[PDB]
Design an enzyme around this catalytic site. Structure first.
Site, PDB file in Angstrom:
ATOM      1  N   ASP A 195      -5.304   3.093  25.159  1.00  0.00           N
ATOM      2  CA  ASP A 195      -4.581   2.192  24.158  1.00  0.00           C
ATOM      3  C   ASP A 195      -2.930   2.770  23.910  1.00  0.00           C
ATOM      4  O   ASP A 195      -2.747   2.991  22.719  1.00  0.00           O
ATOM      5  CB  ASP A 195      -5.261   1.792  22.895  1.00  0.00           C
ATOM      6  CG  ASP A 195      -4.609   0.931  22.162  1.00  0.00           C
ATOM      7  OD1 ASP A 195      -3.847  -0.315  22.642  1.00  0.00           O
ATOM      8  OD2 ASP A 195      -4.685   0.628  20.839  1.00  0.00           O
ATOM      9  N   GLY A 249       0.777  -1.496  -0.111  1.00  0.00           N
ATOM     10  CA  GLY A 249       0.004   0.041  -0.146  1.00  0.00           C
ATOM     11  C   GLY A 249       0.887   1.211  -0.057  1.00  0.00           C
ATOM     12  O   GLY A 249       1.983   1.207   0.181  1.00  0.00           O
ATOM     13  N   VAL A 250       0.145   2.338  -0.276  1.00  0.00           N
ATOM     14  CA  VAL A 250       0.612   3.747  -0.134  1.00  0.00           C
ATOM     15  C   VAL A 250      -0.176   4.783   0.599  1.00  0.00           C
ATOM     16  O   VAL A 250      -1.275   4.239   1.155  1.00  0.00           O
ATOM     17  CB  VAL A 250       0.613   4.152  -1.660  1.00  0.00           C
ATOM     18  CG1 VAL A 250       0.925   5.797  -1.823  1.00  0.00           C
ATOM     19  CG2 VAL A 250       1.388   3.356  -2.657  1.00  0.00           C
ATOM     20  N   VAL A 251       0.315   5.704   1.107  1.00  0.00           N
ATOM     21  CA  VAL A 251      -0.231   6.792   1.732  1.00  0.00           C
ATOM     22  C   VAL A 251       0.051   8.168   1.090  1.00  0.00           C
ATOM     23  O   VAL A 251       1.157   8.574   0.901  1.00  0.00           O
ATOM     24  CB  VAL A 251       0.183   6.871   3.232  1.00  0.00           C
ATOM     25  CG1 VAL A 251      -0.431   8.175   3.992  1.00  0.00           C
ATOM     26  CG2 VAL A 251       0.012   5.675   4.000  1.00  0.00           C
ATOM     27  N   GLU A 268      -1.559  15.655  11.010  1.00  0.00           N
ATOM     28  CA  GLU A 268      -0.418  16.625  11.121  1.00  0.00           C
ATOM     29  C   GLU A 268       0.596  15.245  11.062  1.00  0.00           C
ATOM     30  O   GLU A 268       0.426  13.922  11.358  1.00  0.00           O
ATOM     31  CB  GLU A 268      -0.012  16.780  12.762  1.00  0.00           C
ATOM     32  CG  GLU A 268       1.200  17.361  12.969  1.00  0.00           C
ATOM     33  CD  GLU A 268       1.478  17.449  14.323  1.00  0.00           C
ATOM     34  OE1 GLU A 268       0.721  16.971  15.442  1.00  0.00           O
ATOM     35  OE2 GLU A 268       2.652  18.210  14.655  1.00  0.00           O
ATOM     36  N   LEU A 302       4.107  12.926  11.223  1.00  0.00           N
ATOM     37  CA  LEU A 302       5.116  12.747  12.075  1.00  0.00           C
ATOM     38  C   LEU A 302       6.082  11.707  11.358  1.00  0.00           C
ATOM     39  O   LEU A 302       5.512  10.748  10.779  1.00  0.00           O
ATOM     40  CB  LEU A 302       5.096  12.612  13.326  1.00  0.00           C
ATOM     41  CG  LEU A 302       4.789  14.031  14.057  1.00  0.00           C
ATOM     42  CD1 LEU A 302       3.101  14.152  14.375  1.00  0.00           C
ATOM     43  CD2 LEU A 302       5.329  13.839  15.536  1.00  0.00           C
ATOM     44  N   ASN A 349       1.626   3.770  19.019  1.00  0.00           N
ATOM     45  CA  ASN A 349       0.762   4.932  19.011  1.00  0.00           C
ATOM     46  C   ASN A 349       1.314   6.244  19.640  1.00  0.00           C
ATOM     47  O   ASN A 349       0.445   7.487  19.815  1.00  0.00           O
ATOM     48  CB  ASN A 349      -0.473   4.655  19.797  1.00  0.00           C
ATOM     49  CG  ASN A 349      -1.441   3.830  19.038  1.00  0.00           C
ATOM     50  OD1 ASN A 349      -1.236   3.406  17.734  1.00  0.00           O
ATOM     51  ND2 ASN A 349      -2.239   2.940  19.904  1.00  0.00           N
TER      52      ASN A 349
END
EC number: 2.7.11.22
Lengths: 286, 258, 69
Positions: A115, A4-6, A69, A71, A120
């Site tokens: 969590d 996959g890609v983002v 945002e 990171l 995270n």
């Protein structure tokens, strides 16, 4: 690795790099996931420098976009990358300080993250660490009611939840943070249980099996069993050997059995361990 | 662990002023009325009971409804749809196990379709801009209860009962803040059951006195008094249950001691 | 059947109802597509100011592509 890609994007100004997150929606049944409903509604009420910013939401015909945002890395990957190196104390102290700031903010705005784990907590090249993923977060009340049982990734689950506490609170997040603190120091999870009972036994062997003295009411909790092996509490200096007197003091306060005795995020902010905190950039390239 | 109680109380006092629906919004509605709204809310009390949902879930849903109706024109035939969508959203937000869409379609005696409930869900979220973490009368009551001298479950149940009645009637309740309605409910309930009044500890906390709560109190006492004659009875029935110590059956005092 | 199972204000014109809702729902496109120069409808970047680039999932934190539970 990972298929996959983002979509990522840079602009300028202060908030220049952002990441796009997208959700496919079921149109005839269910609709917007409740996890997304909790994260979006709650996250938009948590604008803090140590909480990853939700910048926008786009609800189309069948998709839901979240503009976050951006990171560079997450703590699990950072620790894996530093697994044989060792994170400098000044960087560990800075991360803990900041995580406590972000957590305290959540709590004072009636939100439980529920969590907290290395995966995270996102980090950037400037030395900042922020809380991510509020899909399992929930707006609490005073007094707290009974909420979802057996929440929190096992390794970071407080003993209250494991012992079937009818009501749990902000202290469940402090326990998780205490486990992460100990983990940043060794890069190995404090209590890597294989099951609920194993998780509990690992905690008991390290902190000793709680009695009525240490934790009043423990022996009446829903999932308490008098068959529990009675382990002795080990010297805290043994839990995380490299940690100093102040570090051990704080950690012991973060891992207190009694949730009503366990230190709060805002109280932890005044501990002498932070007396020399600074904001170092990471020791490894992200 | 009362470490954040004050932070939280202050945060809720700030947010309630924001998540507050327009007081006279019903005048702007070309078709619906306060009476149709009362009918809708009453049915939601029933729906909450049918699926054993939390009272908070009901309060949240009414907040969403009023905020949506404060900006969107709705014809009478879509009103139950707004109500169903709002309850679905409140269940998703508040409940551990929220009822599925099919259950909500069913409960409307199959008036609308699943896709329709979901598109409405889409619309309410857009109109409310996903701002669902609204403060409620219930959230304040929950905080005030911690000041009982000593704790009384009959007082708590009657206070919750009074707070719910406030939901049914847009006039006059839309004009008071959740924290104020909760103050009036706590005092009226406490007074009714024990003869005691709004604790001074609660004056230190909220900054409210019986004098500041009075206007709300006069309204609420009348609502309490006329409750057996109200066209909507789902709340009274709900509170007859022993779960709530049959508090709706109690007799309201004739006068207060303000 | 139960008592909670009730219609309140009559039968509805399903065809027109669905059509009214479709319309109302067609709002979330406008200014956001404008600000981020991305066409959320078609999932196609555009205009400019935000240099959209599709990056492989292994290059950024997994949170960013993690699906809901």
């Amino acid at each position: 690795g990972t298929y996959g890609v983002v979509y990522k994007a840079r602009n300028k100004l202060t908030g220049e790099v952002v990441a796009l997150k997208k959700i496919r929606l079921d149109t005839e049944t269910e609709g917007v996931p409740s996890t997304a409903i909790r994260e979006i509604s709650l996250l938009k009420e948590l604008n803090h420098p140590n909480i990853v910013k939700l910048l926008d939401v786009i609800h189309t015909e069948n998709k839901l976009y979240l503009v976050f945002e951006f990171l560079h890395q997450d703590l699990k990957k950072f620790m894996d990358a530093s697994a044989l190196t060792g994170i400098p104390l000044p960087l560990i102290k800075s991360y803990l300080f900041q995580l406590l700031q972000g957590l305290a903010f959540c709590h004072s705005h009636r939100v439980l993250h529920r969590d907290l784990k290395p995966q995270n907590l996102l980090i950037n090249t400037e030395g900042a660490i922020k809380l991510a993923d509020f899909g399992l977060a929930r707006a609490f009340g005073v007094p707290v009611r009974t909420y979802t049982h057996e929440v929190v990734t096992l390794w970071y689950r407080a003993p209250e939840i494991l012992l079937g506490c009818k009501y749990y609170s902000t202290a469940v997040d402090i326990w998780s943070l205490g486990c992460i603190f100990a983990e940043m120091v060794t890069r190995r999870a404090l209590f890597p249980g294989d099951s609920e009972i194993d998780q509990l036994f690992r905690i008991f062997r390290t902190l000793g099996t709680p009695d009525e003295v240490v934790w009043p009411g423990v022996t009446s909790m829903p999932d308490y069993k008098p068959s529990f092996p009675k382990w002795a509490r080990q010297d805290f200096s043994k839990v995380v050997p490299p940690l100093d007197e102040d570090g051990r003091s704080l950690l012991s306060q973060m891992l207190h059995y009694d949730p009503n005795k366990r230190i709060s995020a805002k109280a932890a902010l005044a501990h002498p361990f932070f007396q020399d905190v600074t904001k170092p950039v990471p020791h490894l390239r992200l | 662990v009362p470490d954040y109680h004050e932070d939280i109380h202050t945060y809720l006092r700030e947010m309630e002023v924001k998540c507050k629906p327009k007081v006279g919004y019903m005048k702007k509605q070309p078709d619906i009325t306060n009476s149709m709204r009362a009918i809708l809310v009453d049915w939601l009390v029933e729906v909450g009971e049918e699926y054993k949902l939390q009272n908070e879930t009901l309060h949240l849903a009414v907040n969403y409804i009023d905020r949506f109706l404060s900006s969107m024109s709705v014809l009478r035939g879509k009103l139950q749809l707004v109500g169903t969508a709002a309850m679905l959203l409140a269940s998703k937000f508040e409940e551990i196990y929220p009822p599925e869409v099919a259950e909500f379609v069913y409960i409307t005696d199959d008036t609308y379709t699943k896709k329709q409930v979901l598109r409405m869900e889409h619309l309410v979220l857009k109109v409310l801009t996903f701002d669902l973490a609204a403060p409620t009368v219930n959230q304040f009551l929950t905080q005030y209860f911690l000041h009982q001298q000593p704790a009384n479950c009959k007082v708590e149940s009657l206070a919750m009962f009074l707070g719910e009645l406030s939901l049914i009637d847009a006039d006059p309740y839309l004009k008071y803040l959740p924290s104020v309605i909760a103050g009036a409910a706590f005092h009226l309930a406490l007074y009714t059951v024990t003869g005691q009044s709004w604790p001074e500890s609660l004056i230190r906390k909220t900054g409210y006195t019986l004098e500041s709560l009075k206007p709300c109190l006069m309204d609420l006492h009348q609502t309490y008094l006329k409750a057996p004659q109200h066209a909507q009875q789902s709340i009274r029935e709900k509170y007859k249950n022993s779960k709530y110590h049959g508090v709706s059956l109690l007799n309201p005092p004739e006068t207060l001691n303000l | 059947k139960p008592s909670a199972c009730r219609n309140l204000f009559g039968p509805v014109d399903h065809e027109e109802l669905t059509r009214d809702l479709e319309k109302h729902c067609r709002d979330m496109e406008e200014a956001s597509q404008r600000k981020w120069n991305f066409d959320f409808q078609n999932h196609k970047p555009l205009e400019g100011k935000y240099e959209w680039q599709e990056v492989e999932k292994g290059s950024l934190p997994e949170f960013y592509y993690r699906p809901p539970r």
